[PDB]
Write a protein that binds this ligand. Structure first.
Ligand code: F43
Ligand code: TP7
Ligand code: CL
Ligand code: CL
Ligand code: K
Ligand code: MG
Ligand code: MG
Ligand code: MG
Ligand code: MG
Ligand code: MG
Ligand code: MG
Ligand code: MG
Ligand code: MG
Ligand code: MG
Ligand code: MG
Ligand code: MG
Ligand code: MG
Ligand code: MG
Ligand code: MG
Ligand code: NA
Ligand code: NA
Ligand code: NA
Lengths: 548, 442, 248, 548, 111
């Protein structure tokens, strides 16, 4: 069969993908592009309106001396210019991040004990339902106790709510189902049983604060906002004194003792509070992505949906804006979720492994790393050599390094069932690639690459960590594009091959199994395409409170 | 020598130990037992071997509710604790006869570790204690069972948690009374970031010992912060002596006189009487049926008032056997005494202010918690320069079981290990004995 | 003890509330059962719940402070800590928020008092709370028109009175009866209806409110005219200011 | 003339303002309110659409047993229900914060030295203009060097740009005026001469990154985004090698050595990066507000416009959302910028001072503090006693404490010309108020109050600081409503009385003297009113890239 | 102090200027600071003037660090000793002394 990227290459160029030569300089520069033309016209209008020059195609060098390409969003039939995959220009991408940033998971296990033990009152599915009615009024920013309170406009905050989940089927089934993430409905049977056993009789809230607030404020707002309205709702629903010593136990539990943040805070040089992208460990990112519960018979699809999730968040929004900005890093990321290229390479490796070892049946050792990561690396690099259109597509060495190594690392983890040997395979891929083509990535690409092999299995203080626990704040990883989202994919890979319901945190997995989210986490690449086409509807807009 | 003041020192039964000890014999800068306590708290680590073993067996590493399926390792750590601890000790020590201690507790489930003092003498700060201890136990466990290169990273995760992705040792199975340097509210704050429950745990809820340990840590921080330099030094030393060391038996005697039937108000009345009898305050002016008191020694008035504040906490929260009202005592002892006398309250209003916010943040939705989770580094309770938190320690020591976030809930690992250390458990004893020993060298 | 400076009726009333030797004037009789109903923590005839075992059943180590400090009866028993909370109108209620907290920690043992503008609270062991609450409800701490027992939804201290002279209550816990001229408590302090209301007596008349109040106002006794009380407040400000600078 | 709040009181209530009695419970609860009615209907629609209950007036206690009041925005004729002053419901308030968050000031002094000394190339007004045309193309997110870049949509980022200023008039006049903040145009003559002398021959950029980016990301993004596009524009405009050793000097200068953040980063318990509200010192907030350059003949107006700026930002957005959330703290803040109440009290105090001492002519000592703060405190409290409608309006003790003490503290500073004695007067006001009414604020209101007198003149490590340098991270101030914005006013007060052009940073003052901002910082209270009326047009919306 | 330029780059508080001859009295100021910094007379505290009194080398006594968690006692003890020594040298008033503090240690603790 055709390689999976052939359709996309045929769409981009007039030549067949194998053709070695072309003609440049005859496309009219920016004028070849619908999108650049839109931008030129908009820049003229903006400049005139505000009295300050802005976008101008004659500044600096003239874009479009070559073909300005369309990109296929992988697993879709949507082809767009790359500007439509810039996070600024794509409301789906922005909403994906808002939906993570504005979420916290907050236990009820201490709260219910305070109620039963310190106050001496009962807790049942009926009282929990009454509490959930209360907190779904309060959480978006509405009052339950005081006189003369002024409140948020319900339509501005329609995206904010609270659901619960629990491993106890009897409680889950009796709470009003409007408020329940039903583990049995959302997950296939095997996964549901795993997840219910992890949660047990615990009861957890999934709290989503308003997008408009998250955008006005920051990620570290989320757990505070959550806790304030949990606290008010405990007071109201359980008929408590409105501020007694026990109130502080609900606060400490909701803010500290029983809260799960999406991200942990960052060191000062990159100072940020909780629920920012740099604090989100790779295992959590894999668990946020919901591909695992839909596409579980295809571990490649699951792994690469996680790669798309992370490449966008970590390279485009986090490294490309929070940590830098400007034009940023769209195509460093798109390489990992367009043109079915990473898909081609990773299906090749999965078949290699399936045929030679069986998934998860290879020895978890360096022999397997050397075998699989080498074989898949050579396959991927051969494709760039055999298809000049492919090499002109993924024109930056970094893009190619990330894609080839992601396939190699995921494939290695498919063989071993262990993410750490997957990670070793990622670094071996880089070393081989570098020697094959006498190049790798941008000036600073392989900082982590060269520390990489030695730090995979290290146990020292700021070196040793299982991959699932690493993240964008792991020291070697803190700076550079073309790694973080791919590591999230490698973290997912062995778990997808094993059929595991989650990678690192079962509560995080369950917390995004929810169709009341604005973004559809089951189909990340489909959503990026919908946003590119300007067909995604985000939360948080202010049209209701601005003029017609 | 610098100050002329002398104080009489007592034990926690109210019995005289040594008369007329120079004030500076109690200074953190001079007293060798305070030095030993502070270096001990820098260097001591609790290791939960059972916890490490269970985290490995279940692959539950990296923080609350986290687990990595397929990574489970079943190692007989507690059954081989003697060998593992001895191997760890060989790495932790500098030389074979130094002051390194590694002691198993609970049938090998826990270890007390005291990292050698010499490592801290050539260190900037105190993180060598958890970091040296952690890697010595990670290596000792790997070596005990010949854990492979492929699996050893799980042992590291079980010991130290999600660090360095997290800034903290998130999910770790070691504990210290100190917390990481990044969490300091300001430079010099590290001896303040010690949970009240940890102090109460280490001192086995002995009220005077808890108050003493807390005061020693708070007032030693005041020296590190520069607050007890120059003009303020005597104020801080007198506060340490009278509020935390029961100087002149003043706290003890106020509690004795008010314990049966007394209130915050009756303690105030007795303290004002005692300040007047001792010549600390004097009537300055007469208004209409109201005496305005003055003082020629504001630092000594402050110290007397601070002793009364401690006694009022002991009487009020002691009578309830419930800690929560310490926020109220800290507020209204100070509010009342100002309108009773015309003199400023303890720490010139800063205890009262601390108490206002502490009351709010222990009875509201917005943050805080129960008394035991506060500390001198907490944003709510950092404002008084040593004169509030020791009362919170006393109140939690006196709590008979009214708190959800009790020392039993928050500080069990700390309790088991740190209460073993005599100078941590009974600091009043050792600091008074050391003061007596150096009394003629001041 | 002195308690408070000043030469006004307000100042004297502030001292009287603080002075445990001052006999609070009893204005109304309330049954033990009705105090329990007003509090709303347990039903009449219900055993006191416990938060921990009786102290006697515990095996505590030697502690001289414990030995010297007599626990209150509810602490001996292991009672829960519970509360009673009052709102006081700025239109001349007899007690006011800091007056209460100051007075409570002079008069009552084992007390957690909190002051806010619109509410003032005491938390203590339940059986002891019941005894204190009787005094807080029966005496001149309380007027049934210008004070309210309220555990939530406390708005009213700063509001205009209604045409009967009653403070606003969002939850209408205290109802003035025109036929008797008496106020009935029809709900407990958290707002749940009582099976049978509790007689709280007649509101104090204007003359008596003025005799008894502890708030300074221009249309009563103004604080600025109690020059000795102002002098002491200003003194404390100055001495605190100097002390924080250089301990002089 | 009538006291300034009388019109507002007559609007709110049927009774005259002095009347002591009213009738309650007859207004139909929420049904009395146009805004609550809108919210009830919206909640029904939201719940029906999403399948989860939301706003419901029957949850908890029944709002509106008393009159739900309109508020006059002070200095305007606009009356709105308080919900329209909630930051969630008020796009002007949101944009005010975005315009601060997305701004940094970046010197060109080190960069031009790098150019002349390390590159050996000349800098002139002409080359600066060429650089500014370049950076105004690049800053919003457009390319100047590489081929096949994908870019931000110019119309989504129309609010992003770069201007410059300098104290050298002849140099300023030679740069293209589209790019220049003209100090002589924006400031009255004496202020202009002060500001130009502070800046001298220095040349400074005012960089504003896109609102849409700031909302997607955080404040710590701003200086990074700024520096990336300055760096690209230096490369393009001065014809440099596109990445050589000197490139790093431009980066270090723009990111560290000559950048001024609006806010400094926060400690871990309240972890946040730069350019978040807690990091903005009170003197900067006063300088951001532009009332000083318009209303200079009226120091009360200038001071109270700063109070409004700060009460909204610090209590509503910062304390009420970043540090808590939910219904939040609208009316804790509105008390300081509605019904002309603080205005009445502060004009009383200013006139008292004028008459007795002359502005700025009182001794700077405790005698003046005692005199002025006491007199003004008694005036304000008398008004609540004389006008029952006023007391029912500012129903929370905290609101009254903040308003009375702000008037007392500003007045004391009008007398001394020194903010520190102003601050002492604020605390004395609290102590007097507490004794007069036997109440002050909410449970935790006077933590800083009671520490206050002693810490005004302290010199110790974490105690001693001039008021202008204090901010929301000053330890005593870190938690509580009803202080921070009022302190910004007190910081402004002596400087307004003195006629000073700025309070703490002349660069910050000049940087907001710019009508290309989205929010009009010259008329903060007018803008809050416009937002309340749903007449403000914010930046950052996604309408262009979402369905019609 | 002379310019009231305190609190960070380009910052200035008009009206707060204080004109103190610190460098001209450096010997007295340094000696007064040393008495506060030391623990005991003749311990390992060093306070040495450099550059004609424009600079001082300060070595805070090692004993302070032996009973400290970390190293911040060096700047914090030094800062407050020099703030106090300057205030005392010139009898700087309660009203003005906070400017000396800002000139020595900056915007801390707001920063
Ligand atoms: C439950 C608490 C304890 C606590 O930690 N926070 C509360 C409640 C909280 C909620 C109330 C929302 C709701 O009704 O659902 C919010 C809005 C914070 C949030 N979670 O969004 C808030 N207070 Ni409160 N809170 C306020 C105030 C106050 C005043 C109200 C006194 C009066 O007589 O009405 C008193 C404190 C005092 O007495 O000084 C007060 C108490 C209390 N405050 C008591 C409830 C009082 C009651 O039962 O009626 N707040 C104020 O004084 C005015 C501003 C007002 C805030 C809302 C705004 O700024 O618009 C609100 C600020
Ligand atoms: C105290 C502290 O909370 P914690 O005790 O750490 O949970 C802190 N909150 C606050 O200071 C809340 C301030 C805003 C709400 C109260 C305004 S009066 C914070 O979240 O970092
Ligand atoms: Cl150009
Ligand atoms: Cl002294
Ligand atoms: K944001
Ligand atoms: Mg083709
Ligand atoms: Mg239904
Ligand atoms: Mg924690
Ligand atoms: Mg959907
Ligand atoms: Mg030894
Ligand atoms: Mg081996
Ligand atoms: Mg007499
Ligand atoms: Mg009777
Ligand atoms: Mg007039
Ligand atoms: Mg009218
Ligand atoms: Mg319904
Ligand atoms: Mg223009
Ligand atoms: Mg720096
Ligand atoms: Mg305009
Ligand atoms: Na161009
Ligand atoms: Na309800
Ligand atoms: Na309601």
């Amino acid at each position: 069969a055709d390689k999976l990227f052939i359709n996309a290459l045929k769409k981009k160029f007039e030549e067949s993908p194998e053709e070695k030569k072309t003609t440049f300089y005859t496309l009219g520069g920016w004028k070849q592009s619908e999108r650049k033309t839109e931008f030129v016209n908009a820049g003229k209008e903006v400049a005139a309106k505000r009295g300050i020059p802005q976008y101008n195609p004659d500044i600096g060098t003239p874009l479009g001396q070559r073909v300005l390409m369309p990109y296929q969003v992988s697993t879709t039939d949507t082809y767009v210019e790359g500007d439509d995959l810039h996070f600024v220009n794509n409301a789906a991408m922005q909403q994906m991040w808002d939906d993570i940033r504005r979420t916290v998971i907050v236990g009820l296990n201490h709260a219910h004990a305070v109620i039963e033990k310190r106050l001496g009152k009962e807790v049942t599915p009926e009282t929990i339902t009454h509490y959930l009615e209360t907190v779904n009024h309060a959480m978006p920013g509405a009052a339950v106790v005081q006189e003369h309170m002024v409140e948020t406009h319900p339509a501005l905050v329609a995206d904010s709510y609270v659901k619960v989940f629990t491993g106890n089927d009897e409680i889950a089934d009796e709470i009003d189902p409007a408020f329940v993430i039903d583990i049995n409905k959302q997950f296939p049977e095997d996964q549901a049983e795993t997840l219910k056993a992890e949660v047990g009789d615990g009861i957890w809230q999934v709290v989503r604060i308003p997008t408009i607030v998250s955008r006005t404020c920051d990620g570290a707002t989320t757990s505070r906002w959550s806790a304030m309205q949990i606290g008010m709702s405990m007071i109201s629903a359980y008929k408590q004194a409105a501020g007694e010593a026990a109130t502080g136990d609900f606060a400490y539990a909701a803010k500290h003792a029983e809260v799960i943040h999406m991200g942990t805070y960052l060191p000062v040089r990159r100072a940020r509070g909780e629920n920012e992208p740099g604090g989100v460990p790779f295992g959590y990112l894999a668990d946020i992505c919901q591909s695992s519960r839909v596409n579980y018979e295809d571990p490649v699809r699951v792994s690469l949906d996680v790669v798309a999730t992370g490449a966008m968040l970590y390279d485009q929004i986090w490294l490309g804006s929070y940590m830098s900005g400007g034009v940023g890093f769209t195509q460093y990321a798109t390489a990992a979720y367009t043109d079915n290229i990473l898909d081609d390479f990773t299906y090749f490796g999965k078949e290699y492994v399936e045929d030679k070892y069986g998934l998860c049946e290879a020895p978890n050792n360096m022999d397997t790393v050397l075998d699989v990561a080498t074989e898949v690396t050579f396959y991927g690099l051969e494709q760039y050599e055999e298809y000049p259109a492919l090499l002109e597509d993924q024109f930056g060495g970094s893009q190619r390094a990330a894609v080839v190594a992601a396939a190699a690392g995921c494939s290695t983890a498919f063989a071993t069932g262990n993410a750490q040997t997957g990670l070793s395979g990622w670094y071996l891929s880089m070393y081989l690639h570098k020697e094959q083509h006498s190049r790798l990535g941008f000036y600073g690409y392989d900082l982590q690459d060269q520390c990489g092999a030695s730090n995979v299995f290290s146990i020292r203080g700021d070196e040793g960590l299982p991959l699932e626990l690493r993240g964008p704040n792991y020291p070697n990883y803190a700076m550079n594009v073309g790694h973080q989202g791919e590591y999230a994919g490698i973290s997912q890979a062995p778990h997808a091959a094993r059929g595991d319901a989650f990678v690192f945190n079962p509560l995080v997995k369950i917390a995004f199994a929810d169709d009341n989210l604005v973004f559809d986490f089951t189909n990340v690449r489909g959503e990026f395409a919908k946003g590119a086409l300007r067909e995604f509807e985000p939360a948080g807009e202010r049209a209701l409170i601005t003029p017609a | 020598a610098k100050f002329e003041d002398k104080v009489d020192l007592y034990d926690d039964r109210g019995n005289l130990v040594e008369e007329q000890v120079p004030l500076e014999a109690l200074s953190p800068l001079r007293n060798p037992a305070i030095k030993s306590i502070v270096q001990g708290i820098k260097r001591t680590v609790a290791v939960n071997l059972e916890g490490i073993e269970n985290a490995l067996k279940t692959a539950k590493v990296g923080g609350p509710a986290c687990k990595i399926m397929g990574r489970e390792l079943d190692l007989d750590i507690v059954g081989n604790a003697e060998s593992i601890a001895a191997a760890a000790k060989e790495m932790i020590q500098v030389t074979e006869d130094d002051d390194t201690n590694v002691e198993l507790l609970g049938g090998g489930k826990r270890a007390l570790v005291q990292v050698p003092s010499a490592r801290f003498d050539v260190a900037a700060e105190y993180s060598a204690a958890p970091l040296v201890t952690a890697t010595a136990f990670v290596q000792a466990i790997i070596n005990e069972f010949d854990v492979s290169m492929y699996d050893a990273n799980m042992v590291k995760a079980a010991v130290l948690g999600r660090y360095p992705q997290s800034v903290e040792y998130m999910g770790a199975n070691i504990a210290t009374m100190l917390d990481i340097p990044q969490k300091l509210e300001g430079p010099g704050y590290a001896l303040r970031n010690i949970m009240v429950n940890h102090v109460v745990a280490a001192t086995l809820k002995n009220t005077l010992q808890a108050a003493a340990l807390s005061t020693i840590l708070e007032q030693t921080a005041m020296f590190e912060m520069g607050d007890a330099v120059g003009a303020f030094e005597r104020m801080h030393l007198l506060g340490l002596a009278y509020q935390g060391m029961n100087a002149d038996n003043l706290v003890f005697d106020l509690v004795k006189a008010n314990g049966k039937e007394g209130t915050v108000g009756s303690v105030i009345a007795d303290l004002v009487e005692r300040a007047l009898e001792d010549g600390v305050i004097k009537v300055e002016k007469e208004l209409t049926d109201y005496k305005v008191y003055g003082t020629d020694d504001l630092a000594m008035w402050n110290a007397y008032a601070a002793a009364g504040l401690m006694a009022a906490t002991m009487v009020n929260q002691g009578a309830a056997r419930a800690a929560q009202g310490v926020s109220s005592t800290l507020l209204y002892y100070n509010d009342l005494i100002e309108f009773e006398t015309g003199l400023p309250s303890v720490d010139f209003g800063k205890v009262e202010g601390t108490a206002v916010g502490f009351s709010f943040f222990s009875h509201s939705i917005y943050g805080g918690g129960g008394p035991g989770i506060f500390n001198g580094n907490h944003i709510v309770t950092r404002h008084s320069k040593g004169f509030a938190i020791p009362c919170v320690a006393a109140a939690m020591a006196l709590d008979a079981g009214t708190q959800m976030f009790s020392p039993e809930a928050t500080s069990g690992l700390i309790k088991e290990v740190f209460s073993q250390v005599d100078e941590f458990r009974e600091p009043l004893k050792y600091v008074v004995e050391a003061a007596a020993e150096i009394k003629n060298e001041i | 003890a002195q308690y408070y400076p000043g030469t006004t009726k307000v100042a004297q009333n502030r001292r009287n509330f603080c002075n445990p030797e001052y006999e609070l004037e009893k204005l109304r009789e309330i049954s033990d059962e009705d105090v329990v109903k007003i509090l709303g923590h347990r039903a009449p005839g219900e055993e006191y719940p416990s938060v921990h075992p009786p102290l006697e059943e515990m095996d505590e180590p030697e502690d001289a402070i414990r030995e010297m400090v007599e626990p209150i009866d509810g602490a001996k028993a292991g009672d829960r800590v519970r509360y009673i909370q009052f709102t006081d109108s700025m239109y001349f209620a007899p007690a006011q928020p800091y007056v209460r907290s100051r007075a409570y920690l002079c008069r009552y043992r084992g007390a957690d008092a909190g002051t806010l503008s619109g509410r003032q609270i005491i938390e203590t062991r339940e059986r002891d709370l019941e005894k204190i609450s009787k005094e807080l409800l029966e005496t001149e701490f309380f007027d049934p028109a210008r004070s309210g027992v309220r555990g939530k939804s406390v708005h009213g201290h700063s509001l205009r009175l209604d045409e009967d002279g009653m403070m606003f209550d969002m939850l209408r816990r205290q109802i003035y009866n025109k036929d008797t001229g008496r106020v009935e408590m029809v709900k407990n302090q958290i707002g749940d209806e009582l099976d049978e209301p509790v007689d709280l007596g007649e509101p104090l008349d204007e003359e008596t409110l003025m005799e008894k109040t502890t708030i300074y106002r221009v249309d009563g006794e103004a604080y600025r005219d109690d020059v000795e009380a102002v002098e002491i407040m200003q003194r404390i400000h100055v001495l605190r200011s100097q002390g924080g600078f250089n301990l002089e």
